[PDB]
PDB file of C-alpha atoms and ligand atoms in Angstrom:
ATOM      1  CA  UNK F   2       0.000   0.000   0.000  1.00 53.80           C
ATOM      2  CA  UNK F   3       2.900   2.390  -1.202  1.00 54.25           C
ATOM      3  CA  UNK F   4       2.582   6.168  -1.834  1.00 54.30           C
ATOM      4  CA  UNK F   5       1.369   5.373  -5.297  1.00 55.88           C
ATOM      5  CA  UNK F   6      -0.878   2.493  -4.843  1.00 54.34           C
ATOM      6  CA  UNK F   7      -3.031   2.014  -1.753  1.00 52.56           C
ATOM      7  CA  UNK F   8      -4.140  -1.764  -2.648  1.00 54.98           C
ATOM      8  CA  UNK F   9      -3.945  -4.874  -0.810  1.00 53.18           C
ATOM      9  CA  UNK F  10      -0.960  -6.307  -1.923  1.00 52.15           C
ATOM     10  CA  UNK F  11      -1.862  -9.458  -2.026  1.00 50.28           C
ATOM     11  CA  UNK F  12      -2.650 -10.442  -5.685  1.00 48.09           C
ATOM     12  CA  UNK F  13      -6.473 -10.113  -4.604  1.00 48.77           C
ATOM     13  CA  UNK F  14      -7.411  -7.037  -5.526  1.00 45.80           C
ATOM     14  CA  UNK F  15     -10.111  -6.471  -8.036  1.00 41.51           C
ATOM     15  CA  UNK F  16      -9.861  -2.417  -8.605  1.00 40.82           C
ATOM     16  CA  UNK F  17      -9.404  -2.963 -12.537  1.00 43.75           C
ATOM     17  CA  UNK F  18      -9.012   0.880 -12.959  1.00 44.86           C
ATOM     18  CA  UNK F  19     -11.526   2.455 -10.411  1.00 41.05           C
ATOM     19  CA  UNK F  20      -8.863   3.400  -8.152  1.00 41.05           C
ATOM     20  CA  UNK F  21      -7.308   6.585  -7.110  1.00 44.27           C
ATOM     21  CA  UNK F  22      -3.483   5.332  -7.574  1.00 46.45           C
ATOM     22  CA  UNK F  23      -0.992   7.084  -9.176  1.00 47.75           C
ATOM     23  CA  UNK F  24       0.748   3.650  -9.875  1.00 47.28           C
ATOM     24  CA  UNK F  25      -1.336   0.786  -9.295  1.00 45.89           C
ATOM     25  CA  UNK F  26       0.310  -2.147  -8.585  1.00 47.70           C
ATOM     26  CA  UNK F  27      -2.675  -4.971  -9.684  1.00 45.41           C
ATOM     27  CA  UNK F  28      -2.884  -7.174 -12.563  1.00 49.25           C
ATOM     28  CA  UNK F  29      -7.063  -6.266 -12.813  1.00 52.57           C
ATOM     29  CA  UNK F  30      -5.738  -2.836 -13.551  1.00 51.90           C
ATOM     30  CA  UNK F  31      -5.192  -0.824 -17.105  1.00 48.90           C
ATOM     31  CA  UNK F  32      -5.474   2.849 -16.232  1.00 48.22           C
ATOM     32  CA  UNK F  33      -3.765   5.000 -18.753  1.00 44.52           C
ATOM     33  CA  UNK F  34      -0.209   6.738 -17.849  1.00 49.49           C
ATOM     34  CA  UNK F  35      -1.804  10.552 -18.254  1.00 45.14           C
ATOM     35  CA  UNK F  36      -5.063  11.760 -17.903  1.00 47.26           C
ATOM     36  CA  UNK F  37      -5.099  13.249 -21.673  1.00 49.82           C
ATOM     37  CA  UNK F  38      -4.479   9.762 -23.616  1.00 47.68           C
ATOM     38  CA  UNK F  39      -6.621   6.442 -23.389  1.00 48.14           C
ATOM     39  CA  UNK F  40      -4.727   3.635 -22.031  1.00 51.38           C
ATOM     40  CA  UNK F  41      -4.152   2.476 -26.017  1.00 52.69           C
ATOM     41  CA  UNK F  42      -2.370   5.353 -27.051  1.00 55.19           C
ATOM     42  CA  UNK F  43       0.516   4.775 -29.579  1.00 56.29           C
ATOM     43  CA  UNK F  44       3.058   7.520 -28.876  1.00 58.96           C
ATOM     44  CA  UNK F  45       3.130   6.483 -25.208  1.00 58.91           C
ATOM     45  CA  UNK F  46       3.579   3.055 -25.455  1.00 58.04           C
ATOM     46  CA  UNK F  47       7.353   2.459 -24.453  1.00 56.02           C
ATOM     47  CA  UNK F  48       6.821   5.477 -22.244  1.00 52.22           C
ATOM     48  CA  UNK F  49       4.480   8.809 -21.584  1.00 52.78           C
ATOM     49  CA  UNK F  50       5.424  11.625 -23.240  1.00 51.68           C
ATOM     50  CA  UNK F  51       3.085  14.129 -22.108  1.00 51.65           C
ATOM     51  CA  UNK F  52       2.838  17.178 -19.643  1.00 53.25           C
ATOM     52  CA  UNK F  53       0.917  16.360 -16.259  1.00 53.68           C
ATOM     53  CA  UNK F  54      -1.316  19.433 -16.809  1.00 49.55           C
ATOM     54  CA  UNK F  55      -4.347  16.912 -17.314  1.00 49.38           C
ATOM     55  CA  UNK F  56      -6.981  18.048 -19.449  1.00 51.43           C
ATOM     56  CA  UNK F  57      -5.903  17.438 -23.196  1.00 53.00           C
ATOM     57  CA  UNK F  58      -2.642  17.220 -25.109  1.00 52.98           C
ATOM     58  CA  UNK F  59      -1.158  18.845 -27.785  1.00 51.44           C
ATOM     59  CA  UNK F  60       1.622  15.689 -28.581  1.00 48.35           C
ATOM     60  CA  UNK F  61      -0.828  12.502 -29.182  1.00 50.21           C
ATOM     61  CA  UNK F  62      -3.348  12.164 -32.043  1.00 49.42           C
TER      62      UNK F  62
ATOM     63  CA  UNK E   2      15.039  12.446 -36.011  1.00 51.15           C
ATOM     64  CA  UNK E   3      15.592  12.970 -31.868  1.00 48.97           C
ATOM     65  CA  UNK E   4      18.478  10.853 -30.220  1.00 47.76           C
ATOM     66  CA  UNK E   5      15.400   8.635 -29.400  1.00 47.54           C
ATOM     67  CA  UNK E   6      13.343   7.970 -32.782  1.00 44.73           C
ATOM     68  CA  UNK E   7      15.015   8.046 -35.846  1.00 41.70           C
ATOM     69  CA  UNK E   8      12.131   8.665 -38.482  1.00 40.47           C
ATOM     70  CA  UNK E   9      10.724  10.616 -40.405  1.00 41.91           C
ATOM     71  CA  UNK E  10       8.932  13.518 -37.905  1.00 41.81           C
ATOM     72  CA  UNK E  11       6.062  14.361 -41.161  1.00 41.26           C
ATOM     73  CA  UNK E  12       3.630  11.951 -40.001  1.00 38.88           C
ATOM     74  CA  UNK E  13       4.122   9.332 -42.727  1.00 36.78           C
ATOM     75  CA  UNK E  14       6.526   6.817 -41.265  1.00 34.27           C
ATOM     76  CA  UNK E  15       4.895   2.954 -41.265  1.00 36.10           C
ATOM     77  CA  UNK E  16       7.535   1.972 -38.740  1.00 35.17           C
ATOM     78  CA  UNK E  17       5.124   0.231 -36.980  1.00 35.52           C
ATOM     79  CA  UNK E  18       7.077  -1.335 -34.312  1.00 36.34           C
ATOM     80  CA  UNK E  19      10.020  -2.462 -36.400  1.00 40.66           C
ATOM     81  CA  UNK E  20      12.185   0.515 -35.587  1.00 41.67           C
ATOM     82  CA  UNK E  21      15.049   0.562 -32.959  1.00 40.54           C
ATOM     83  CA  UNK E  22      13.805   3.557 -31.545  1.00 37.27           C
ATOM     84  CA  UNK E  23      13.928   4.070 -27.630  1.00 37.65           C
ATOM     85  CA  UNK E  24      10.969   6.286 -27.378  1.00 35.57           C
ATOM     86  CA  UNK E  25       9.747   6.241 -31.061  1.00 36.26           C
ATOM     87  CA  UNK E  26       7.642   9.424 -31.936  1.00 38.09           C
ATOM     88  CA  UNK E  27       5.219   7.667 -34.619  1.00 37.23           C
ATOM     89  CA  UNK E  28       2.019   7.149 -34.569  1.00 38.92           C
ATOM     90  CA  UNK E  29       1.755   3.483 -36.190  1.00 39.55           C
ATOM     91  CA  UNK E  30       4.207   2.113 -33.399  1.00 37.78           C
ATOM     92  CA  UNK E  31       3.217   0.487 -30.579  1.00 43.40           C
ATOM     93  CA  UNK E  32       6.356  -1.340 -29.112  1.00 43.92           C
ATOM     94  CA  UNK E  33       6.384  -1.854 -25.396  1.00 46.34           C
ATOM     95  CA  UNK E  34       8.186  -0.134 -22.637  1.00 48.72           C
ATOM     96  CA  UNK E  35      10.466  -3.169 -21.646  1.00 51.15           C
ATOM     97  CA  UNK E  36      11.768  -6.011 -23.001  1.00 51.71           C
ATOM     98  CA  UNK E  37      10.071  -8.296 -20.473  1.00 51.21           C
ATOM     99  CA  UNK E  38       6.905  -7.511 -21.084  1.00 52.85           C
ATOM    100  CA  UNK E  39       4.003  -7.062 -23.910  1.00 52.27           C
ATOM    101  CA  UNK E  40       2.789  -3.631 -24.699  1.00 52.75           C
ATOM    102  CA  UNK E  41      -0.576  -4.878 -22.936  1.00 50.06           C
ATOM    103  CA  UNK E  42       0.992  -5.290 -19.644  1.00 50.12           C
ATOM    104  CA  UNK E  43      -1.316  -4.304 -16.874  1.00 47.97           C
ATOM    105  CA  UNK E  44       1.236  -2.999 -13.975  1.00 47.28           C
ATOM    106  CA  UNK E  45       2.958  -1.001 -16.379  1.00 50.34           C
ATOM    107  CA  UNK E  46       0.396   0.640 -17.907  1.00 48.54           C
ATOM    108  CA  UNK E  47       0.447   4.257 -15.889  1.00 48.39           C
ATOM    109  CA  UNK E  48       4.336   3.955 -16.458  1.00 46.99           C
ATOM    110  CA  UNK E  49       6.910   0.980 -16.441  1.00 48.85           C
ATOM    111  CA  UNK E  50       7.778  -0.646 -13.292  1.00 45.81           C
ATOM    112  CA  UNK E  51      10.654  -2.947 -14.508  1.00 46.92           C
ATOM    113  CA  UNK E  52      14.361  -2.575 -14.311  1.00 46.50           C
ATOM    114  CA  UNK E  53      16.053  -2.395 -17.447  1.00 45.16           C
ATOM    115  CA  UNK E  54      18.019  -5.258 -18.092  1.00 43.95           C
ATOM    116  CA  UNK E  55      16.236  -6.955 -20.719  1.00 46.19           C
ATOM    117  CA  UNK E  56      15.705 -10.775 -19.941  1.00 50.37           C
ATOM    118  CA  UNK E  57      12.533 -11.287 -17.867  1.00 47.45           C
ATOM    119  CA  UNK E  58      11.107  -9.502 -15.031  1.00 51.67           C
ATOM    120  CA  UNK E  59       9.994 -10.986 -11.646  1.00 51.60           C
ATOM    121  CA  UNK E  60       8.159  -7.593 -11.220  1.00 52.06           C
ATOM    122  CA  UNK E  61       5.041  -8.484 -13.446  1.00 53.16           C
ATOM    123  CA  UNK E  62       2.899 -11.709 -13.966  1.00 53.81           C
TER     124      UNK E  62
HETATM  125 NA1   NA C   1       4.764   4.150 -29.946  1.00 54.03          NA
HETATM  126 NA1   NA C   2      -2.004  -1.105 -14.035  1.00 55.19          NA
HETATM  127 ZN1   ZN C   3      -6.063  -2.621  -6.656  1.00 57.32          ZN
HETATM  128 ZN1   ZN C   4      -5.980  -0.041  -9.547  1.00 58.32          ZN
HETATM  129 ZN1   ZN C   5       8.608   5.502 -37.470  1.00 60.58          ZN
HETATM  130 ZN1   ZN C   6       8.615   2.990 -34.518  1.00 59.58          ZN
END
Protein backbone atom coordinates (compact mmCIF):
# COMPACT_ATOMS: atom_id res chain seq x y z
CA UNK A 1 0.00 0.00 0.00
CA UNK A 2 2.90 2.39 -1.20
CA UNK A 3 2.58 6.17 -1.83
CA UNK A 4 1.37 5.37 -5.30
CA UNK A 5 -0.88 2.49 -4.84
CA UNK A 6 -3.03 2.01 -1.75
CA UNK A 7 -4.14 -1.76 -2.65
CA UNK A 8 -3.95 -4.87 -0.81
CA UNK A 9 -0.96 -6.31 -1.92
CA UNK A 10 -1.86 -9.46 -2.03
CA UNK A 11 -2.65 -10.44 -5.69
CA UNK A 12 -6.47 -10.11 -4.60
CA UNK A 13 -7.41 -7.04 -5.53
CA UNK A 14 -10.11 -6.47 -8.04
CA UNK A 15 -9.86 -2.42 -8.60
CA UNK A 16 -9.40 -2.96 -12.54
CA UNK A 17 -9.01 0.88 -12.96
CA UNK A 18 -11.53 2.45 -10.41
CA UNK A 19 -8.86 3.40 -8.15
CA UNK A 20 -7.31 6.59 -7.11
CA UNK A 21 -3.48 5.33 -7.57
CA UNK A 22 -0.99 7.08 -9.18
CA UNK A 23 0.75 3.65 -9.88
CA UNK A 24 -1.34 0.79 -9.30
CA UNK A 25 0.31 -2.15 -8.59
CA UNK A 26 -2.68 -4.97 -9.68
CA UNK A 27 -2.88 -7.17 -12.56
CA UNK A 28 -7.06 -6.27 -12.81
CA UNK A 29 -5.74 -2.84 -13.55
CA UNK A 30 -5.19 -0.82 -17.11
CA UNK A 31 -5.47 2.85 -16.23
CA UNK A 32 -3.76 5.00 -18.75
CA UNK A 33 -0.21 6.74 -17.85
CA UNK A 34 -1.80 10.55 -18.25
CA UNK A 35 -5.06 11.76 -17.90
CA UNK A 36 -5.10 13.25 -21.67
CA UNK A 37 -4.48 9.76 -23.62
CA UNK A 38 -6.62 6.44 -23.39
CA UNK A 39 -4.73 3.63 -22.03
CA UNK A 40 -4.15 2.48 -26.02
CA UNK A 41 -2.37 5.35 -27.05
CA UNK A 42 0.52 4.77 -29.58
CA UNK A 43 3.06 7.52 -28.88
CA UNK A 44 3.13 6.48 -25.21
CA UNK A 45 3.58 3.06 -25.45
CA UNK A 46 7.35 2.46 -24.45
CA UNK A 47 6.82 5.48 -22.24
CA UNK A 48 4.48 8.81 -21.58
CA UNK A 49 5.42 11.63 -23.24
CA UNK A 50 3.09 14.13 -22.11
CA UNK A 51 2.84 17.18 -19.64
CA UNK A 52 0.92 16.36 -16.26
CA UNK A 53 -1.32 19.43 -16.81
CA UNK A 54 -4.35 16.91 -17.31
CA UNK A 55 -6.98 18.05 -19.45
CA UNK A 56 -5.90 17.44 -23.20
CA UNK A 57 -2.64 17.22 -25.11
CA UNK A 58 -1.16 18.84 -27.79
CA UNK A 59 1.62 15.69 -28.58
CA UNK A 60 -0.83 12.50 -29.18
CA UNK A 61 -3.35 12.16 -32.04
CA UNK B 1 15.04 12.45 -36.01
CA UNK B 2 15.59 12.97 -31.87
CA UNK B 3 18.48 10.85 -30.22
CA UNK B 4 15.40 8.63 -29.40
CA UNK B 5 13.34 7.97 -32.78
CA UNK B 6 15.02 8.05 -35.85
CA UNK B 7 12.13 8.66 -38.48
CA UNK B 8 10.72 10.62 -40.40
CA UNK B 9 8.93 13.52 -37.91
CA UNK B 10 6.06 14.36 -41.16
CA UNK B 11 3.63 11.95 -40.00
CA UNK B 12 4.12 9.33 -42.73
CA UNK B 13 6.53 6.82 -41.27
CA UNK B 14 4.90 2.95 -41.26
CA UNK B 15 7.53 1.97 -38.74
CA UNK B 16 5.12 0.23 -36.98
CA UNK B 17 7.08 -1.34 -34.31
CA UNK B 18 10.02 -2.46 -36.40
CA UNK B 19 12.18 0.52 -35.59
CA UNK B 20 15.05 0.56 -32.96
CA UNK B 21 13.81 3.56 -31.54
CA UNK B 22 13.93 4.07 -27.63
CA UNK B 23 10.97 6.29 -27.38
CA UNK B 24 9.75 6.24 -31.06
CA UNK B 25 7.64 9.42 -31.94
CA UNK B 26 5.22 7.67 -34.62
CA UNK B 27 2.02 7.15 -34.57
CA UNK B 28 1.75 3.48 -36.19
CA UNK B 29 4.21 2.11 -33.40
CA UNK B 30 3.22 0.49 -30.58
CA UNK B 31 6.36 -1.34 -29.11
CA UNK B 32 6.38 -1.85 -25.40
CA UNK B 33 8.19 -0.13 -22.64
CA UNK B 34 10.47 -3.17 -21.65
CA UNK B 35 11.77 -6.01 -23.00
CA UNK B 36 10.07 -8.30 -20.47
CA UNK B 37 6.90 -7.51 -21.08
CA UNK B 38 4.00 -7.06 -23.91
CA UNK B 39 2.79 -3.63 -24.70
CA UNK B 40 -0.58 -4.88 -22.94
CA UNK B 41 0.99 -5.29 -19.64
CA UNK B 42 -1.32 -4.30 -16.87
CA UNK B 43 1.24 -3.00 -13.97
CA UNK B 44 2.96 -1.00 -16.38
CA UNK B 45 0.40 0.64 -17.91
CA UNK B 46 0.45 4.26 -15.89
CA UNK B 47 4.34 3.95 -16.46
CA UNK B 48 6.91 0.98 -16.44
CA UNK B 49 7.78 -0.65 -13.29
CA UNK B 50 10.65 -2.95 -14.51
CA UNK B 51 14.36 -2.58 -14.31
CA UNK B 52 16.05 -2.39 -17.45
CA UNK B 53 18.02 -5.26 -18.09
CA UNK B 54 16.24 -6.95 -20.72
CA UNK B 55 15.70 -10.77 -19.94
CA UNK B 56 12.53 -11.29 -17.87
CA UNK B 57 11.11 -9.50 -15.03
CA UNK B 58 9.99 -10.99 -11.65
CA UNK B 59 8.16 -7.59 -11.22
CA UNK B 60 5.04 -8.48 -13.45
CA UNK B 61 2.90 -11.71 -13.97
NA1 LIG C 1 4.76 4.15 -29.95
NA1 LIG D 1 -2.00 -1.10 -14.03
ZN1 LIG E 1 -6.06 -2.62 -6.66
ZN1 LIG F 1 -5.98 -0.04 -9.55
ZN1 LIG G 1 8.61 5.50 -37.47
ZN1 LIG H 1 8.62 2.99 -34.52
Amino acid sequence: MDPNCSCATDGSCSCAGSCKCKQCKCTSCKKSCCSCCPVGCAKCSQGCICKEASDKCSCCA
